C-alpha cells in the first residue's frame, strides 16, 4: 500500500504514497493488466454522460480541498466559505463556475497528472488562457489564433492552453474538431496510394465535405473546424504567417533537402477533454514543443503516416535486401538527426529524447520528494527509438489516474447532432 | 467476458477469451497499474512457501484436465484413473510425480505461457531432457554439459530444457546458482572500474570465495555452481570446447575487431522456477538462441554492463559533445549491426529484432485464433531499440498469468542454509 519503485541502472528507490489519493480507474485488475491498451473506457469521456447534482458536489469538494491545501489555507475560513459558496451554486444551478486562480491550478495540475507525458517537468510554467466568455466559432477562432501566436513566439515556444466554456447539458458543447490545431492534409488517391498525411484522410475529407478548397499538396495545413455552443462547426483558415514551419535538411547528407520534407513547430492537441472538480471542458486546445522522435520516428517513419524510410534508405545506398543489415534502423537514426538539426538551426524549440527522458527522471525525483509520487505510463514515456539507452527504460513506474485530468472524448462527427 | 485488442498499424482486432482460464494475480488493481514493475510479488516464488496437500490437488487436477484436453482424452477412463492415482499419491505422500508426457506438455506450455517472451513462435519445438533421476552436483554437471552440447549443435542452435527433481519440503532444493549456464565474469577493481561483466560481479565473488581460480580477464566464462538436494553448491568448470563463442567484428569498420569483443552463442537461463500442476522445479535450465539486441543493446551498451558506446562513438569520430547529434543512437545501431554480422558470418543461429517481432505478431494472431488468446507483456515484447518500426509496438496486448509457468525465485545465496 506504500509502494516502491526502483531504477535498475542506478539502484535508486522511491516510495510512492500519492497513489492512495487515486480517484479513477486504470482498466486493470489483479487478473489482467491492460497497461498497453490505447484508449480504455476509463480514459474516455462519452458526452451522453452529463453530471448530476449529487455526483457533482463531492467532485467539487475534493478539488477545492486540494486547492486550498496547496495554498496553505486548508480548513481555513476562506476554504470553508468557498465550499459553502460552491455548494450553494450547485444546489441552485446544477453546476458551478471556477474562480480564475482555481482554473489555473486546475489546468496546471491536469498536466502534472498526465501520466503519459514526458515533458511534465515544465508543468508549473503553463500559460492559461481563459476563454469561457467565448460564444461563437469566430470568437473561438480569434482565441485560437492568439494562442498559436503567443505559443509560437517566433520559434521560442512557450507552453499554453486555452479553455473554452465548460459543458452544460451535452447539447451546447464547445468542440475543436481538429485533433491538433496544426496538421497536414491527407488525400485518398485514385491510383490507390495516399498523398500527405494518412492519419488525417478522414478529417481532410470532412473538411472538403464541409466546403474546404484544398491545394491537394503534400504539406497543406488543414483548416480549423470550430463548433461553438453545440452548433454546427465552421471552417477557418489559420493565417499562414502564424504557422511556423521548418524545412528538413541533413547536416551531412546534402541530398536530404531534395526529399522536400518539412514539419510545423507547434504541437497543439485540441481534441481532449479537461476535467476539473467534476466540470467538463470539452474544448481546451493545449500546446508545448516537440520531442524530436515524435516528428522523426512517428510522423515520418510509421507505416500509417509518411513512411519515408524506404526512400531515405535508398538515398543512403544501404543494403535493403535483408532486414538484418538494420538499414531501417540506420536510416531512422539519420532522419531524427536531421529533424533535430533543422529545428535547432532555425532556432525553433525542440528537445531530443535523451535530454527529455533525463528531465523526466529529475521531475520524478522531485515529485516523489515533494509530492510523494508521480503517476507514469512506461509504455508512453519510453521513446519509440533507442528505448533502453535512455534512463526512463530502467525506471519502474506506477500508473494511476489522478484528478484534475485530461481525458479522451469521442470524435465530434460520431456524436454531433446536426 | 470477452475482450478485444487492436493493432493500430493494420487495424486488426482480435478477441481474447483465454484470459478467463487465468488463475495467478498480475500485481495490478483497478487503482494502480504495475505493468512496468520488473519482478512483481506474484511473478516470484519464495522457497519457504512449500505447498500443503490442501491446495496441491486443486492445482494437480487443473493441470491434468488441461493435459487430457490437449490430447483429446477429457473424461476418458485414463483421465479419471490418473486423477485418482495422483489423488492417492498426494494424500499418501504429500506430493506426486509427473509422467514423462505430462512433464513434456508442462515445460512446453510454460514457454507458451511466458508472456514476456518474444520468441514463443518456437514453443512447440522444445527438447525436454528429464533429469529427475539426478541426485548429485556431479550428476547435474553431466546433464548440463549434455544440454549445452545438444543445444549448441555446432552453431545451429536447438531449443532445450533440462529438468531436475522437483522441490519437496523446500529443504532439499536443486538449484543452479548461475543466472545463465554461460556468462562472463565481472571483477570490481580497486579504482571503482569493473573488469568484464558488471552484471556478474557478485556471483563472481561467490565463485571466487568457493575456490575458483579466476583468470581475471574481460571475457572469462564462469564456473557452474551447482546445488543438489539441498546440499552446499559445488564448482564445475564447463569444458571450453563445449562453449561456443563469436568474435565481434563489423562488416565495414575494420577497427571494430580491435575493440577485443566477443560473446557466447547460447542463451541458457538457469535461475527460474518451472511450475507444473502445483509442483515446483527450482532448477530447470532452458536455452534457445539470441535476438541480436540482447547482446548489442543490453549486454554491450547498458551503463551497468560493458558500456562500450563511448569507445565506439569515439572511434567512429562522432560529435559526442551533446546528445542532440544522436551519437549514442548512431553507435548503438553500428554495434548491433556488428553482432548480427559476426554471428551470421560464423553460422551461429541468431535472429534480428525485426524478424523476431514480425514472427511474434504472426504467432500471436495464430494463438488468438486457435487458443482464444495469447498473454503478452508489451513492456518486454517491444525491442530495446527501434521500438516503433517493429510491428509489436502498435499492437495492443493483454497480460495475464497462466499455468504451467516460469516464475522468478530468490537468489539462492540469500535463502540457503549452509552445512559446511
Ligand atoms: C513542453 C513540452 C512538452 C513535451 C516535450 C511533451 C511531450 C509529450 C510526448 C512525447 C507525449 C507522448 C505522445 C506521443 O509520443 O505520441 C505526450 C503526451 C501528452 N502530453 Fe505532453 N509534452 C509537452 C507539453 C505538454 C503540455 C503543455 C500539456 C498540457 C497542457 C501536455 C499534456 C500531455 C497529454 C495530456 C498527453 C497524452 C496523455 C494521454 O493520452 O493520456 N504536454 N507529451
Ligand atoms: C529460441 C529463441 C528464443 C528467443 C529469440 C527468445 C527471446 C526472448 C527475449 C528477447 C526475452 C526478453 C529478455 C530480455 O531481453 O531481457 C525473452 C524472455 C523470456 N523467454 Fe524467450 N526466447 C527464446 C526461447 C525461449 C525458450 C526455449 C524458453 C523456455 C523454455 C523461453 C522462455 C522465456 C522466459 C521464461 C522469459 C522471461 C519471462 C519472464 O521473465 O517472466 N524463451 N525471450
Ligand atoms: C493516438 C493519439 O495519441 C496521442 C495523444 C496525445 C499526444 C500528445 C499530446 C500533447 C503533446 C504536447 C502538448 C506536446 C508534445 N510534444 N507532444 C504531445 C503529444 C500525442 C498522441 C499521438 N501518439
Ligand atoms: C532480471 C531478469 O530479466 C530477464 C528475464 C528473462 C530473460 C531471458 C530468459 C530466457 C531467454 C531465452 C530462453 C532465450 C533468449 N534469447 N533470451 C532469454 C532471456 C533475460 C532477463 C535479463 N534481462
Ligand atoms: C523498469 C522495467 O520493468 C525494466 O527496465 C524492463 C523494461 N523492459 C525490459 N524488456 C526486456 N526485454 N528486458 C528487460 O530487461 C527489460 N527491462
Ligand atoms: C498499443 C500501444 O499501446 C500503442 O502503440 C502505443 C505504444 N506507445 C506509445 N507511446 C507514445 N509516446 N505514443 C504512442 O502513440 C504510443 N502508442
Ligand atoms: Zn496493469
Swiss-Prot record, chain A:
Isoform N-NOS-1 is expressed in brain and colorectum. Found in the Auerbach's plexus of the enteric nervous system. Isoform PNNOS is expressed in the penis, urethra, prostate, and skeletal muscle, and coexists with the cerebellar nnos in the pelvic plexus, bladder and liver, and is detectable in the cerebellum. Heme b binds at residues 117, 408. Changing residue 290 to S: 30% decrease of nitric-oxide synthase activity. Ubiquitinated; mediated by STUB1/CHIP in the presence of Hsp70 and Hsp40 (in vitro). (6R)-L-erythro-5,6,7,8-tetrahydrobiopterin binds at residues 36, 379-380, 393. L-arginine binds at residues 180, 289-290, 294. It is found in: Cell membrane, Sarcolemma; Cell projection, Dendritic spine. Changing residue 290 to F: No decrease in nitric-oxide synthase activity. The PDZ domain participates in protein-protein interaction, and is responsible for targeting nNos to synaptic membranes. Mediates interaction with VAC14. Produces nitric oxide (NO) which is a messenger molecule with diverse functions throughout the body. In the brain and peripheral nervous system, NO displays many properties of a neurotransmitter. Inhibitory transmitter for non-adrenergic and non-cholinergic nerves in the colorectum. Probably has nitrosylase activity and mediates cysteine S-nitrosylation of cytoplasmic target proteins such SRR. Inhibitory transmitter for non-adrenergic and non-cholinergic nerves in the colorectum. Belongs to the NOS family. This is Nitric oxide synthase 1. The lineage of its organism: Eukaryota, Metazoa, Chordata, Craniata, Vertebrata. The gene is Nos1. The chain holds residues 299 to 716 of 1429 of the full protein.
